[PDB]
Each structure stands twice: as C-alpha cells, then as structure tokens.
Design a binder for this molecule. Structure first.
Ligand SMILES: Nc1ncnc2c1ncn2[C@@H]1O[C@H](COP(=O)(O)OP(=O)(O)O)[C@@H](O)[C@H]1O
Ligand SMILES: [Mg+2]
Lengths: 254, 351, 75, 272, 114, 127
C-alpha cells in the first residue's frame, strides 16, 4: 500500500510474544544470553521493524503506514526491559490502566500520561475549537480534584470547576463495537463545555447522550453535514446549535 | 588550553544556574519524552545562528522522522543554502534502523569533521550529538558474539575504555576550540545506570531534565537542584550572579521540607513565615519556565530570549519581596519581569 | 535498621517523590489554597494600581509646591 | 513491586513517621497548658450552675423561636470531636420542628458549618471563624455574645453543645439549657427574689450569655488538643508496623537481584 | 448482550464500589477512619457488606466446619446485591452478611443477634 | 582537643531535636536552647573554597561560638562576625597567634586573655 499510494494500518498483538520466540530460537543455536536470557539485539529486533512506518513525500506517492504495537506488561510496571526499549521508538503512547477500568472509566485511558507528539497537530479544525478548551478544562480539573475528604466549602471558588470535569469525564466514556463519527463528536462535545449540562445530574449524562444523539441524526441531518463539509464550526453554525441543545434541554426530562 | 569564559544562550535556567563556557563540554541528561530534542534544537537556533564559527550535527541512532525536521527546519532558516556556498552546518546521520556495528562509529565520523575545523583551520567549532548513549549501547549488542564474558548489568567489559578513547578527542587544545553539546539518554530514568554514570566525568556542564517537573507543565523541564557547572564561581561570573543563584537553589530545597508537612497538616495550619516561603518558591518555580521559540507549534505562545542582565535583576526582586502582591499565573510563561506585571493587569481587567 | 550508614535512610521531600495517595492529597491541597488567594489579589489590583498613580500624584503636588516657592523667590 | 518501587514507598513512610512523632510533641505541650487554664475557669461555671439549683427553672410548654449553638475549632486531625457535636445537633432539630417552634442555629468555628451546610443551610443566623488557633479567652466570648444581639432575632429558648473534658482518652459531649426571654426567667422560684426589675433581668441574663459561651470555650479546646495527641500516637504506631513489614520485603528483594544478575554472568561465561 | 443488561450493571457497579475501598487504604491505615467525608464513609461501610456477601458454604466443606453447603441460583444473587447497592440494608451489621447462602439468610442471621 | 570535646557533643544534641525546629515555638526553654546554640555552631563551620586556615586561628573562631559569645546575634550575622573577628586578631594580636603555635596548649594565662578580646570586640561590632 505505502509504496504504491494508499494508506495502511498495522496492529501487532502483541510484541511481547515476538521476543520470547527470539529468546528460545536463539538459545538452541548456542548463542550466549544477555539480560533475562534475551539476546544482544532485541533492541535491533524491534527497531528495524518500527522504522518502516513512514509517511512518504508527494513525489513518490504520498502514502502512509501507521502502526499500533500492543505491549503487555507485568503488574503495570513500565520500567522493564522490553517495554522501555519500545517506548523510545514510538512517537506517542496510550497508557491503559486497571484502576481506571474498575472505577468506571472505560476505555481506561490515562489522559494525564498519554502524551503524544501531536503529528503537526492534524486533529481537525472544528475539534480544535471544542477540545482545545476541553484539554485545559480537564487539566485544570486534575490538579485540584483528588481529596475524597472535604472540610470547607467554596462553591463560588472551586466547586464550579470540578463540576465541569465530571460532566466531561462521564461524557468521555463509551461502549464497545459502536464507534462514533467526528461531527457527531463535535455536537456532543459542544454541549458539555458550553455550560449546557451543569443543571443535570451526573448519573444521567450517559442517558442524556443517546437521546441527544438520536435526535440530531434523525431531525438535524443537514446541520451535521455542514460541519463535515466546511471543516470548521462557523459563527452562523454556532448560532443554530445554540437553540438545539437548549430546545432539547427544555424537554429532555419530563 | 586552560582558560574559562562564559556563554549566554538566553534561557533563565542555563544562564542563571548552570552556565556554559566558550569551549567547554555540555551534556543534556534525562529520560524519554522530557524535552531533549527541543532543548537541543532551541540552542541550535539561539547560538548556532549568531555565531561566526561552524557547527556539526552527528545523529547517532535516533528516529529518522526527527532527522527530516532538522534538515528542513534549517533550509528555511538560512543555515543550509542549497545553491551557493554559504552554509554553516554539516550533518552525520546513522539512525536506529541500522545494524549495531554501524551505530558505534557515527560518533567518530562526527568528531573527525569537527576536528579539521579546530586543528587544521584555526577556527572555532560547535559540536552537536544526539544521541551518545547509542554509542555505548551498540557495543553491548556484539560483545558476547565477539567472545567476551559480559560484565555487570549486561554491558561489555570495556565500557569506560572505549568511551574515554572517544571523549578525550573532544577537547579544546591551543590550536582551536570546540564547544560540545551532547544529548545523553538515561535508560528508564535511572541515573545510577553505568552508561550515564560514567559520562558525568567527561563534561564541564550538566543540565539534567526531570519528569516530575515537566508533568507540572513547567517547560524547560530542567531540574534546579541537580544541574551544576564548573564556572559557578565568584571569580568568573561575579559576586552578584553568584549570590542570586545560590538563593534560588536554597529556597527550592526549603520548599521540599514543607511539602511533607502540607501532606498531613494541610495548608491552612502553617505559620505566616512559612506561607511566605511557599508563595515565593512557587513564584520562582513558575518564573524558571520560559516559552521557547520552537514551542510556537505546540503551545501557540510567542517566544522569548532573555538577556543575562535582566535575568539576574528579575530573580533578585522576587526574593526581596517586590512582587509579593501578584497572582502566580502572571509569572507562568513570560520573559522579563516587566512582562509579568503586564499580565496581572490584563487578568484584573477581564475579571 | 536506621542507626548505621549501611542501613538505608530517607531523603527530604520524598512523600511527593513516591506518587501515592499522600502525594496527591498534597498536590491538590496546595491548589485549593493558592487559587483563592489568586482572587483576593486580583481584586485589589484595581485599588493599588490607582494608588501608585496617587503616590506619583502626591509627589507631583509636592514638587509643584517647591516650584511655587522658587517662583515667589524670583518675584 | 520491583526494587525502585519498594524503596520509594518505604522512604515515604519513614518521613511520615518523623512528622507525626514531632507533631505529638507539639500537641503534648498545648494540652499541658490547656489542662492548667481550665481549673480556674472551672469555678467560674460553678456559679452559674449554682443559680439553677436553688431556683429550679424549666422551659414550660412551647416557644415561638429557638437557638442552637455549637462550638468547635477550625482545625482537623482530632478524631471524633466535630462529628460528636454535629450529629448531636441533627438529633434535636429532628426532635424539634414538630412541636411547631422555629429553630435557627449558629455555629462558632468553621468545622461545624462545614458539616451542616448541605442539609441545614437555611437556619444560619451568622457564622464565625478563627477559633482556637490562638488560645481562647474571655474577650473572645464577648464578640460572640455582642454580634448575637446585633441580629434582630428575638430568641426565647436556646442551648449550647460542647465536649466536657473528662480524661486524656475520654471526652463527653453534653448539653446545657439557656433561658433567654424574661418571661421564663421570671417564674415561681423568682418570687422571693428582690430588687431586680424586668429591666435589670434584661441586664443580668445577657452577661450570662457571654459567661456560658466562655465556659464552653475552655472545655472544647482541651478536648480538641488531647485528642490531637492520642490520634497522633496511633498514626505513629501504625507507621512503625508498616516499615518493618516493608524492610523485610526490601531485604528479600535486594538479595534476589544480586542472585538474578549473577546467574546471568555465570551462564554468560559458561555458554561461550 | 450476553449476560443480560440488568446483570451487567450489578457487575460493573460492584467493582466500582470495591476499587474505591482499595484506593483509600493508604489514608485509613495511617490517619484513621475518622478523618473522612460523609460520602466516603458510605463506600467503606457498603463495600465491607459486599466482601462478606461473597463467601458461601460449600457442599464438600461440611465435614470440616459442620455447616450446611448452600447452592444459590443465578436470579437470587442479582436481586440480592441490588439491595446492598441501593442501600436497603444499611442498618444491619456486617457479621450478618457472612457465610450465608441466599440473601434471606442475611436478614435471618441479623434477626438472631439482637 | 580542648574545644572540640565541648563542640562535638553539643552538635550531637542538636541532631536529636532537629525535627522540632520546623514548626516550633510551643516547646520547652531547654529544647528552644538546643535549636539556638546548634545553629550558631553550624554557621561557624561554613568555609569558602581555596581558603585553608592556620590551626591556632581556628582555635580562635571555635572559642567564640562554643563559649557563649554568639547567642545574642542573628544567624546571617554569624558568617560576617567570624570574618571581622579574624582580621582584627591577625593584625592587632599577631603576638598571641604564635603563643599557641609554639606552646600548643591553651594555658589559663591565655584562656583569660581571649576573654578580653571577644567581649571587647562584640561591643564595637554591630554597626
Ligand atoms: N516547549 C516545550 N517544552 C516541553 N515539552 C514540549 C514543548 N513543546 C512540545 N513539547 C512536547 O514534549 C515532548 C518532548 O519530546 P522530544 O523532546 O521531542 O523527545 P525526547 O524523548 O528525546 O525528549 C514532545 O513530544 C513535545 O510534544
Ligand atoms: Mg529525542
């Protein structure tokens, strides 16, 4: 694909099982063991693989080849031998945890640690508007929202900001084998950051989402087609969405 | 050659706390993802354009993506000219898609081009190498296949000998000078590993980037209590530069003894003197951060380049008490101290 | 095993070096204080930023009185 | 799990062991002064109780308005001092507001108002702050009793709730009644009582309000300090048992990495 | 879709209350129970009624301890955990949820001690 | 040997009470003393790079701190007082920094003479 024009994607599930097939195959050839009986060139094993994932220039075809290597680690320790050798080949990571999965954040992504060299920031134009402010409003949340034991009361001061996070945390949860689109994402993210959900209850936002999403695909199909086509959320497109969330919030719970 | 100098790069942690030297040797430590390809491509902007002498970038085993930016980041910036003969840099690139016998000898093709400019011509050179841990680490990949018994944690038994054979050819003799900046990967943030801990002696200046600081948004990530230079000396930098940078580091080590009290007593139990310490120390910590010019695609801010005479004056006043009446969010990501009061007025007007 | 150089000891400021549930009970406690002092001092920047002109103003009036004295001496 | 993670966790609890053992020595002196001051003011609250033994006055049938006063400090880490007062307070306004009387509470100190601002956020006359950081005094009880009159609220029956200091381990939350209208204060036992008028009984009962807040500023401050000593001994005993169980895990994990790296060399030589 | 959407919500909702008891064991061990809020003295007391209500007497273990082996059906466990998550049994002690079969033995063991 | 036997002991009593100093004013007057004397002796032992001292000069400086002639001063004024006490005793008392370098032991005829130097310098210093 990549050497002829198109765009490919490749998942290695996983790459901690392409290493113990090299440790065994090259111990019975009488090659002397290194650390944890791994050979000398396990770094050369993974590095000569993960550098073909290129992005060619446009005088060759312009094709791309993404790669998504999976790595299983023991007891959540990231300082092992084969993890650290492959953290430092990839541009960015997605740190999946266990206490996120069990408290309720599923997909259990540590959004604090999931750093990414942003890839010349090719997010998209409309998502930059709503998730630019979301990124900072969630970062503001995480610095200040870890007490679990309250003694004092500052509803004008602190309790307004942490009420914006739980509305944006419980928005971020998803199901399984039902992935959204990007303009269906711009709509549901618009309603969270613009204050249009602070009068709900957080145990009803997952219920609020599917009733909202079914209403916009059914009754507002020509709205979402101007976000996907024009790229940006324009100022007159900002105008039309201002009623739809408030008209639906007027008759959501009745 | 025995003489020491100073070198001003423009950064308020380099120039205040671990100052460089014209002809010295400079190493950039720290783990993975803390800011070493940015801090080394910002000094290429700062120093290696306003310089009369030449520069060499030797890429010893790194990402071939990152070796396409710096080829194109410096065609539009005039350091490489593709039609005439007025370029001022040379590039040596053997990357991490290469067999581990060829990732041990691009460290030596570097300082052979960067020695003809010092010895033969009587010029002045700059040496940029990223990354020099891949010279050591690619010698451990063919040790036992050669026929040696492996040493401690898995390295070859000739660690401090093949290294010091190379790190003595990077010196300033009495025919020229070399100012060397080398990035040094610390594996798994473990500084007591034998590949970094035998490199702390071939260097004049260490700038150690931590990760627990860059998680607080502070950028450059440079640790204030772990960087160190040789010329931090009251006879080269002066007895005003010295009294400042030994009070910044003394109030930041006073902070950590209070952070163990806050975790139990809480913030509103402390006395009124110790509250004054934490507020200035958080003002100093935020003022050590500075927006680089190469973060104009990451953060969207605008870049600074602070002179040395303003750096000393700004930090001298926060320790005195002449900005005790401001919010901390003024000091985050500014340049001179006069920009940190032009923000506390815009925050109060938009209130 | 602490009364011996061979027996290991601890540093200063190691509670926030671990990353437990006391290192985040303290990283958040500092933001719940220094966010509310940041609007006691952002509100009083209306007054004292006018006071620094008022002091300057005060000086001006003082200097004009001196000028007045000199002007009368000349007369 | 690994050798770094065990060390950084074990290094943390060695810090917390020092801080809580110093903090017990600080609060062992504060209790030792606050034990001394209470016995002078013990005879001050002897007099106001002795008023009600010879003249047995009660709240007769019903009132139109009411007060509830509850003392505390602003400081935490004392165990069960603050929730032994707030849960007593919610055990009476449920018992009241069925006989028809209107109740309005006032909480001196920050920590009472923190507990009772999510359910009882409406019956608040005023709030105070900055109690018990400096030692409490009598002029402190004359700011509570003076701003309680610059409020307009005519109150005819109230009470105050404080922890009566018993011992170093034990405190007992008690209650004491307050007769504040002149109607209930002038009853059958007051028939013998001479020259005081209705306007003098206006004067005398008001000094008792500054008095009976002062008797409860000397009880709840000793008990808040001597439970800041005992609950810090038990954070220091519970840290000695956590590092001695973490030294042993550290010792086995130290020995098992010397052996692990050494077999990597023994097998690296013999495979040549 | 497989285990049924009513069962799947008692499943994930009882791991959520169990994780939150684990994530405070640093503070409870050092400081105390008595320095907690009022919402987080109600994921502590409800997740100690849930741990005890996972222990069951087995049939093969009658010869050890002399207690009758109990078999519960599926539909009487989902029904019996929704009445600890909603908060209907918050007055019964925690020694009553221990080593019993279906949920009606828990209120019966609570009836015995009085 | 004469002055460090009182000094090594008293900088050892400061180490046991070194935790109390962070948040302390409600302590005993004895514990508030060890926090006082132990932080003056720590300020004496600071020393700049490439400045070795003669032996009998160090017996002058350490005699000031451990005997009691520094408690009434401010701790940023200790590292100034030492430098001003030395330059007065090198020039105007050079005959008594060779009576220790020869005799070796501080006799009582010198133990009574340094009492009339430190107290007659502690008056005319704070200016
Ligand atoms: N001004 C800045 N300061 C700190 N980090 C930045 C800045 N701008 C961008 N970053 C992020 O920090 C990361 C640092 O990674 P980089 O320095 O490129 O490689 P390395 O792993 O060698 O440190 C980058 O991915 C970038 O996204
Ligand atoms: Mg890099």
């Amino acid at each position: 694909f990549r050497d002829n024009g198109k765009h490919a994607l490749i998942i290695y599930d996983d790459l901690s099982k392409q290493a113990v097939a090299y440790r065994q195959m090259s111990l019975l050839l009488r090659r002397p063991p290194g650390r944890e009986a791994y050979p000398g060139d396990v770094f050369y094993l993974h590095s000569r693989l993960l550098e073909r994932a290129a992005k060619m220039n446009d005088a060759f075809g312009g094709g791309s080849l993404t790669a998504l290597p999976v790595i299983e680690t023991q007891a959540g320790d990231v300082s092992a031998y084969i993890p650290t050798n492959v953290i430092s080949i990839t541009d960015g990571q997605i740190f999946l945890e266990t206490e996120l999965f069990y408290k309720g954040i599923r997909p259990a992504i540590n959004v604090g640690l999931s750093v990414s060299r942003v890839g010349s920031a090719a997010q998209t134009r409309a998502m930059k508007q709503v998730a630019g402010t979301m990124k900072l409003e969630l970062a503001q949340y995480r610095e200040v929202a870890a007490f679990a034991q309250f003694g004092s009361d500052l509803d004008a001061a602190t309790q307004q900001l942490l009420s914006r996070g739980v509305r944006l945390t419980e928005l971020l949860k998803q199901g399984q084998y039902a992935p959204m689109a990007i303009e269906e994402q711009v709509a549901v993210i618009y309603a969270g950051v613009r204050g249009y959900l602070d009068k709900l209850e957080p145990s009803k936002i997952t219920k609020f989402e599917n009733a909202f999403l079914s209403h916009v695909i059914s009754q507002h199909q020509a709205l979402l087609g101007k976000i996907r086509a024009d790229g940006k959320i324009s100022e007159e497109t900002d105008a039309k969405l201002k009623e739809i969330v408030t008209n639906f919030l007027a008759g959501f719970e009745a | 050659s025995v003489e020491q100098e100073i070198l001003v790069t423009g950064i308020k942690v380099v120039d205040l706390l671990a100052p460089y030297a014209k002809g010295g040797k400079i190493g950039l430590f720290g783990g993975a993802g803390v800011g070493k390809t940015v801090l080394i491509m910002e000094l290429i902007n700062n120093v290696a354009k306003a310089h009369g002498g030449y520069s060499v970038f030797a890429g010893v085993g790194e990402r071939t993506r990152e070796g396409n930016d710096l080829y194109h980041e410096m065609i539009e910036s005039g350091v490489i000219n593709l039609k005439d003969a007025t370029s001022k840099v040379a590039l040596v690139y053997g990357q991490m898609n290469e067999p581990p016998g060829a990732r041990a000898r691009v460290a030596l093709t570097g300082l052979t081009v960067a020695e003809y400019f010092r010895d033969q011509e009587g010029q002045d050179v700059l040496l940029f190498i990223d990354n020099i841990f891949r010279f050591t680490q690619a010698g451990s990949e063919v040790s036992a296949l050669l026929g040696r018994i492996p040493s401690a944690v898995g390295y070859q038994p000739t660690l401090a000998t093949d290294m010091g054979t190379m790190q003595e050819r990077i010196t300033t003799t009495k025919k020229g000078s070399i100012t060397s900046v080398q990035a040094i990967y610390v594996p798994a943030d473990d500084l007591t590993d034998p590949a970094p801990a035998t490199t702390f002696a071939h260097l004049d200046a260490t700038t150690v980037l931590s990760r627990a600081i860059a998680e607080l948004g502070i950028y450059p990530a440079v640790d204030p209590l772990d960087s160190t230079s040789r010329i931090m000396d009251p006879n080269i930098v002066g007895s005003e530069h010295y009294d400042v940078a030994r009070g910044v580091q003394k109030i930041l080590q006073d902070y950590k003894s209070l952070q163990d009290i806050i975790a139990i007593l809480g913030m509103d139990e402390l006395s009124e003197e110790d509250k004054l310490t934490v507020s200035r120390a958080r003002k100093i910590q935020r003022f050590l951060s500075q927006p680089f010019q190469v973060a104009e695609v990451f953060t969207g801010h605008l870049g600074k380049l602070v002179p040395l005479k303003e750096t000393i004056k700004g930090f001298q006043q926060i320790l005195a008490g002449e900005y005790d009446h401001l919010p901390e969010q003024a000091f985050y990501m500014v340049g001179p101290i006069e920009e940190a009061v032009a923000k506390a007025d815009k925050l109060a007007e938009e209130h | 095993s602490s009364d011996t150089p061979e027996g290991v000891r601890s540093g200063a400021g190691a509670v926030r070096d671990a990353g437990g549930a006391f290192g985040k009970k303290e990283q958040a406690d500092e933001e719940r204080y220094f966010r509310a002092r940041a609007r006691e001092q952002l509100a009083a920047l209306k007054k004292h930023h006018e006071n620094e002109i008022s002091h300057h103003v005060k000086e001006i009036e003082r200097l004009q009185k001196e000028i007045e004295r000199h002007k009368q001496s000349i007369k | 799990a690994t050798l770094k993670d065990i060390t950084r966790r074990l290094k943390s609890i060695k810090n917390i062991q020092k801080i809580t053992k110093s903090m017990k020595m600080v609060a062992a002196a504060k209790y030792a002064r606050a034990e001394r001051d209470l016995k002078p003011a013990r005879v001050y609250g002897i007099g106001s109780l002795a008023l009600y033994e010879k003249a047995d006055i009660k709240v007769p049938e019903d009132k139109k308005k009411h007060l509830i006063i509850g003392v505390s400090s602003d400081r935490g880490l004392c165990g069960a001092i603050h929730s032994s007062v707030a849960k007593q307070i919610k055990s009476e306004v449920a018992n009241l507001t069925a006989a028809g009387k209107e109740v309005k509470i006032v909480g001196v100190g920050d920590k009472i108002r923190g507990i009772l601002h999510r359910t009882h956020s409406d019956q608040f006359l005023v709030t105070f702050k900055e109690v018990g950081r400096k030692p409490p005094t009598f002029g402190d009880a004359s700011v509570i009793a003076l701003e309680l009159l610059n409020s307009g609220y005519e109150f005819d029956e109230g009470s105050i709730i404080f922890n009566r200091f018993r011992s170093v381990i034990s405190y007992k939350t008690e209650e004491k009644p307050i007769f504040s209208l002149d109607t209930v204060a002038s009853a059958e036992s007051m028939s013998i009582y001479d020259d005081i008028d209705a306007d003098v009984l206006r004067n005398y009962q008001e000094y008792s309000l500054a008095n009976i807040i002062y008797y409860s500023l000397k009880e709840s401050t000793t008990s808040e300090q001597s439970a800041r000593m005992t609950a810090m001994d038990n954070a220091s005993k519970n840290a000695s048992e956590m590092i001695d169980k973490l030294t042993l895990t550290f010792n086995r994990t130290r020995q098992a990495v010397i052996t692990k790296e050494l077999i990597e060399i023994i097998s690296g030589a013999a495979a040549l």
